[PDB]
Ligand binder design. Structure first.
Ligand code: HEM
Ligand SMILES: [Ca+2]
Ligand SMILES: [Ca+2]
Ligand SMILES: [O]
Length: 306
């Protein structure tokens, strides 16, 4: 069983070291907190939170970094290396990369203004990476609500609260124009924009992402507070201002009878959202972990110990 006190004797300063690393990085890269939270999400949705996503290519298995959902998108890997090295210095061969990334995600959320809590610990590191599984398990922005629900259920998160609360991760961070071009100019082969996108916001987004423009250009997920972790993400949805299709469907999908009340409840109360976010985050962090003597304590998060 994972426990928040797992390193209280072996490495009491781990969370502090992780926090210091992120604080320093945030000075030059204000996007890093969002990026790190996302790395944990993409780790957990593929064989569980086992740091499998951190492994680089080998001649026997491909890296998950080349998955459709990670390539030219996932980032912050060197920062994870930095905190890992610092933690290894403070406590040699003690903290797994899987746990390190979990703590980094929580600290990132807190540093951005979100809730503060002690995540369950005791996870161990995978002995391989899963590229095919990542391509199959990571959700896509063009997913319908039923598909999003399917994706979460597939990894072990059955609750709509899991989906709605964790989607709140889009209260900060960036998104490439490529992922919303359809909503802006030709949605579902209609030759028209997505009708669930607020028309005034549509104009703004079209200005940021013109047709035939730079598809790699970045836009903010949350037009209200781009870098602050708060419940504004949900207020946007209520006004049809969710950035990507998967965001807005939580409120506008014909299958949203169960998610609409959740969106409203999180938009109405920060406390309600923060509580739900912590609960859902811990549930995601509890997806098929390697524990006890299973797996190992990777020394270099990019390679399996030899
Ligand atoms: C519900 C399904 C989800 C879909 C389809 C989805 C999709 C996306 C997409 C398309 C991007 C933009 C990537 C890019 O432009 O390179 C992104 C970024 C991001 N997502 Fe998600 N996401 C989902 C769930 C989540 C969850 C569960 C979390 C965390 C709890 C999360 C946190 C983030 C963050 C923080 C960013 C910004 C990363 C950065 O700026 O580096 N996402 N997501
Ligand atoms: Ca994983
Ligand atoms: Ca925000
Ligand atoms: O994401």
């Amino acid at each position: 069983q994972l426990t928040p006190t797992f390193y209280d004797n072996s490495c009491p300063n781990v969370s502090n070291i992780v926090r210091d690393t992120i604080v320093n990085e945030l000075r030059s890269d204000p996007r890093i907190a969002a990026s790190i939270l996302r790395l944990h999400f993409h780790d957990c949705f593929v064989n569980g939170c086992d740091a499998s996503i951190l492994l680089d290519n080998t001649t026997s298995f491909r890296t998950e970094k080349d998955a459709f959902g990670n390539a030219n998108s996932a980032r912050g890997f060197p920062v994870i290396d930095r905190m890992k090295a610092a933690v290894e210095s403070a406590c040699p061969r003690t903290v797994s990369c899987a746990d390190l990334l979990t703590i980094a995600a929580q600290q990132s959320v807190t540093l951005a203004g979100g809730p503060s809590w002690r995540v369950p610990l005791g996870r161990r590191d995978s002995l391989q990476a899963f590229l095919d599984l990542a391509n199959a398990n990571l959700p896509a922005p063009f997913f319908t609500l039923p598909q999003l629900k399917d994706s979460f259920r597939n990894v072990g998160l059955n609750r709509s609260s899991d989906l709605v609360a964790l989607s709140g991760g889009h209260t900060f961070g960036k998104n490439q124009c490529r992922f919303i071009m359809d909503r802006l100019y030709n949605f579902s082969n209609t030759g028209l924009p997505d009708p669930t996108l607020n028309t005034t916001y549509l104009q703004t987004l079209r200005g940021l992402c013109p047709l035939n423009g730079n598809l790699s250009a970045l836009v903010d997920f949350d037009l209200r507070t781009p870098t602050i972790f708060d419940n504004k993400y949900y207020v946007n949805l209520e006004e049809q201002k969710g950035l990507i299709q998967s965001d807005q469907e939580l409120f506008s999908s014909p299958n949203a009878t169960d998610t609409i009340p959740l969106v409203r409840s999180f938009a109405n109360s920060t406390q309600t959202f923060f509580n739900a976010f912590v609960e859902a985050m811990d549930r995601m962090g509890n997806i098929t972990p390697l524990t006890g003597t299973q797996g190992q304590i990777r020394l270099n998060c990019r390679v399996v110990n030899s």
